């Protein structure tokens, strides 16, 4: 399984499918080192949209396939979220989580809307809050003010980081 919404750009980076980044290295060094944490492997980003952040993500993935990733994570691999929908919807999105938790070998980057939704709220957020499953978020604070914060335990789950326009 681990397909459809489940996808990765790391091989794609080893496939050279994407762009060598610059300059967010030590920025990524943080984002990288977020995974180190028994507490929170899981960073989130703030900043200006469309600026390269999901490539900054890929920057990790490069540095991953570059093995600029140090040890523990080197086995693990990017997952780039896919967003879409189809009776219920999220249960799928709920479902994949054990799969990747079953994967023992990867990481996902949650992308932008980390959502306070109508149909929602805690979705993976407990399995997030399960204290497992290394993952990454990003947004600008304007959203960040809410979901990660209004819990604050997802704040206790998430590590915020932001970088200015280069």
């Amino acid at each position: 399984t681990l397909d459809s919404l489940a996808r990765d750009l790391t091989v794609i980076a080893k496939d050279g499918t994407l762009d060598p980044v610059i300059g967010r290295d030590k920025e990524i060094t943080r984002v990288i080192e977020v995974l180190s944490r028994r507490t929170k492997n899981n960073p989130v980003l703030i900043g200006e949209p469309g600026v390269g952040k999901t490539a900054i993500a890929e920057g990790l993935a490069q540095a991953i396939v570059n093995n600029e990733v140090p040890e523990t994570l080197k086995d693990k691999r990017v997952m780039s979220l896919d967003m879409g929908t189809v009776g219920e919807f999220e249960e799928r999105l709920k479902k994949v989580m054990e799969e990747i938790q079953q994967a023992g070998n990867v990481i996902l980057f949650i992308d932008e809307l980390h959502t306070l939704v109508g149909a929602a709220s805690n979705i993976l957020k407990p399995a997030l809050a399960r204290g497992e499953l290394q993952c990454i978020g990003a947004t600008t604070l304007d959203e960040y003010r809410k979901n990660i914060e209004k819990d604050a335990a997802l704040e206790r789950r998430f590590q915020p980081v932001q970088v200015d326009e280069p």
Partner: protein, 90 residues
Amino acid sequence: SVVDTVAILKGLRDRYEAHHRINISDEAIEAAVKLSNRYVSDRFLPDKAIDLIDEASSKVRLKSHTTPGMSTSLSEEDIAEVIAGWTGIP
């Protein structure tokens, strides 16, 4: 940084011109980079430049797209006009 933007714009330099069939002139490219950063609060020079750019790339194409030969994008007007179209007092 404004400059890295230019590079990252240089990154997409081929991109939307190969979409818009034009020739980007880095003069413009650095221009708005300053200029947008100067004049545009909201979107971000990582984009808003390209915004202007593609929009300029449009405006040229627009003229170039239909009845107004230069395929290249000027420095100035591409920035200027559009940016003046953005605001005024070119």
